Design a protein around this ligand. Structure first.
Ligand code: HEM
Ligand SMILES: *[C@@H]1O[C@H](CO)[C@@H](O[C@@H]2O[C@H](CO)[C@@H](O)[C@H](O)[C@H]2NC(C)=O)[C@H](O)[C@H]1NC(C)=O
Ligand SMILES: *[C@@H]1O[C@H](CO)[C@@H](O)[C@H](O)[C@H]1NC(C)=O
Ligand SMILES: *[C@@H]1O[C@H](CO)[C@@H](O)[C@H](O)[C@H]1NC(C)=O
Ligand SMILES: *[C@@H]1O[C@H](CO)[C@@H](O)[C@H](O)[C@H]1NC(C)=O
Ligand SMILES: [Ca+2]
Ligand SMILES: [Cl-]
Ligand SMILES: [Zn+2]
Length: 595
């Protein structure tokens, strides 16, 4: 809306209705509506956008204009009064490994990306946003409230740029602004391969006819491969250590080097693809480069789907799993596969699962060297600790043997994320993920907490007493009322995350509904879902059902001891078995001749 920094619509393409392979963009999944689920379209709207002016201006843009007769509290102020805490002791999740957190980020990145408006480089805009805190067009700065310490050290605000949106089209009549999802809505390993054909090709190794992904040629992990470097300048990964000067990786997803464990995970996935391609070349010597790439790509996709629905979702959704994701009944071509705008806020529950440190463990799962445990903030956009400080194995061990943070109404987001986040475009470890999340809810025209409760068929609290009952927490409810005045005004991100978790789950009732629904649609609406008869042969599916993240690690690292259930809290050596005892992926059912 207004067209300043909008995204150009539908570079068209004709559909191969008989191909056994996903397109890269996600077009042609749905036959009747080939664009559903494709990258670079408007995120779906489950409820209509809510803007100050009804078109594109977010609530809190204009000081005089209230929401339902009340000013919205500052994002940073909600963060300070509600989201922060001091004491890291006792915060960890005793029945979830750190791989629980990290898998969620991986899934999230497969499904959605709403990139900030390209103001351009060379920006006086960035300057005006950051230095002068001048709100206008794409600049929607996060202003510091009264007595905020950042006043004394940072300035009047943190910069924030509005999300990219769909261009208005030749009718040109007035419509609410829709933000773009830049990645394919399908759970399709797009974070490995890309959602855009040009990037997808640049990632491939087209020098050999082997259907491999390109690997780093300047650095190796004791023989094993790294992602290639991103040669785009300037590099945030160089900026954090100018001595080291190690650039970011180049992956199927732009965000791959945001933090060291995410870059680690992207590494495992790349290695898995190359492994799969080599194994398939031995089984089918006649298969060409294309066929090899497509087939391993198709296996990796199913791997991510199986881990997510079998291992991850049950431990997020708990008792609500069955209620939103009943057993599969085949492809339903009437289901909307698109990711919804609100899902991209609901899935940010992950931010409350990130602990304040990261460890490198040695082969005995003991602290690796003198600085084994690092503050998380030092690991944003950090590639040098991988390339120059031991490769990925010591990080992978930490994933297995260390724990996720548990969400806690009094201990929501670690200060590493809340005070010291580094943004790739800027220069300081000074940003606030919580305040950004809340600013972003408004950027995207999110209906408020009570609207979503209603959508989910849940009671809608009107008074302090009502809120207390929902939150089962009198103090939090009061602090929310003091800031927001009405529950109707509470931003969906803090609203949904505030609720106590469902039985055996890690999210509250509002979020289990919003997530459950989306995941159901992600499965049921996908023509290439792995369990859709015809996608894979029955014998292939029998093989696939044996995959695990533990096997993934065994095959792609020099780690030889792993737990059988990677996602629960596991202690060495009690909970760890030799790799040789762990189920393998049998690729024999992929063997194909013509005789
Ligand atoms: C650094 C960041 C993380 C780890 C140290 C981290 C972790 C997660 C997890 C564990 C998630 C889900 C289980 C998850 C989801 C989403 N994130 Fe978040 N995250 C880190 C940093 C960021 C930053 C920076 C953003 C952008 C914020 C903005 O609005 O500008 C961010 C976003 C998201 C997101 C929305 C993605 C989209 O559609 O654009 C998630 C679903 N995370 N993170
Ligand atoms: C694309 O594939 C080729 C062939 O497999 C890769 O080549 C090999 O590179 C490794 C490491 O440099 C050597 O140890 C092998 O002996 C090489 N063999 C051949 C056949 O040349 C090549 O590096 C890949 N390209 C990229 C950019 O990843
Ligand atoms: C930067 O990297 C070097 C190795 O190149 C390391 O010894 C040094 O401590 C690093 N400095 C910072 C800023 O962390
Ligand atoms: C398929 O989807 C539509 C819309 O969700 C719905 O009306 C119908 O009940 C579904 N059909 C099946 C096969 O379950
Ligand atoms: C720990 O995790 C597993 C998940 O399969 C479960 O069987 C066990 O009861 C868990 N404890 C919880 C959820 O607190
Ligand atoms: Ca995808
Ligand atoms: Cl929505
Ligand atoms: Zn080694």
């Amino acid at each position: 809306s207004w067209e300043v920094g909008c995204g150009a619509p539908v570079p068209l393409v004709k559909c191969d209705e008989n191909s056994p392979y996903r397109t890269i963009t996600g077009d042609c999944n749905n036959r009747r509506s080939p664009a559903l689920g494709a990258a670079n379209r408007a995120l779906a709207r489950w409820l209509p956008a809510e803007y100050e002016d009804g078109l594109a201006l977010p609530f809190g843009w204009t000081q005089r204009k209230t929401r339902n007769g009340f000013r919205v509290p500052l994002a940073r102020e909600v963060s300070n009064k509600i989201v922060g805490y001091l004491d890291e002791e006792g915060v960890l999740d005793q029945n979830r490994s750190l791989l629980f957190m990290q898998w969620g980020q991986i899934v999230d990145h497969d499904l959605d990306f709403a990139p900030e408006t390209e103001l351009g480089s060379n920006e006086h805009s960035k300057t005006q946003c950051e230095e002068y805190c001048i709100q206008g067009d794409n600049c929607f700065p996060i202003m510091f409230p009264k007595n905020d310490p950042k006043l004394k050290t940072q300035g009047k605000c943190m910069p924030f740029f509005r999300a990219g949106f769909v261009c208005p089209t030749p009718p040109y009549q007035s419509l609410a602004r829709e933000q773009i999802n830049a990645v394919t809505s399908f759970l399709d390993a797009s974070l490995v391969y890309g959602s855009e054909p040009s990037l997808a090709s640049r990632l491939r190794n087209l020098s050999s006819p082997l259907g491999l992904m390109a690997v780093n040629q300047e650095a190796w992990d004791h023989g094993l491969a790294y992602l290639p470097f991103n040669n785009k300048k300037p590099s945030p990964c160089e900026f954090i250590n100018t001595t080291a000067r190690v650039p970011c990786f180049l992956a199927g997803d732009f965000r791959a080097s945001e933090q060291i464990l995410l870059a680690t995970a992207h590494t495992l996935l790349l290695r898995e693809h190359n492994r799969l391609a080599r194994e398939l070349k031995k089984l089918n010597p006649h298969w060409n480069g294309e066929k090899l790439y497509q087939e391993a790509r198709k296996i990796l996709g199913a791997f991510i789907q199986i881990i997510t629905f079998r291992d991850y979702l049950p431990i997020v959704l708990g008792s609500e799993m069955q209620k939103w994701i009943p057993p599969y009944q085949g492809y339903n071509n009437s289901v909307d596969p698109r990711i919804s705008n609100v899902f991209t806020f609901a899935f940010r529950f992950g931010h409350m699962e990130v602990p304040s440190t990261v460890s490198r463990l040695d082969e005995n799962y003991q602290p690796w060297g003198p600085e084994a445990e690092l503050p998380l903030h030092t690991l944003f956009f950090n590639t040098w600790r991988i390339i120059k400080d031991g490769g990925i194995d010591p990080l992978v061990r930490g994933l297995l043997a260390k724990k996720s943070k548990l969400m806690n109404q009094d201990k929501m987001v670690t200060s590493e994320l809340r005070n010291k986040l580094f943004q790739p475009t800027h220069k300081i470890h000074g940003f606030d993920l919580a305040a950004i999340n809340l600013q972003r809810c408004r950027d995207h025209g999110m209906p408020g907490y009570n609207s979503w409760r209603g959508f989910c068929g849940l009671s809608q609290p009107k008074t302090l007493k009502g809120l207390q009952t929902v939150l089962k927490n009198k103090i939090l409810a009061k602090k929310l009322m003091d800031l927001y005045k009405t529950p109707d005004n509470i931003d969906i991100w803090i609203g949904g995350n505030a609720e106590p978790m469902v039985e055996r789950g890690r999210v509250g009732p509002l979020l289990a509904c919003l997530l459950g629904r989306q995941f159901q649609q992600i499965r049921d609406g996908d023509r290439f879902w792995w369990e859709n008869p015809g996608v894979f042969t029955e014998k292939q599916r029998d093989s696939l059902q044996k995959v695990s993240f533990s096997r993934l690690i065994c095959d792609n690292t020099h780690i030889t001891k792993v737990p059988l259930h990677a996602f629960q809290a596991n202690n060495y050596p009690h909970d760890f078995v030799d790799c040789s005892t762990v189920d393998k992926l049998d690729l024999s059912p992929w063997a194909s001749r013509e005789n």
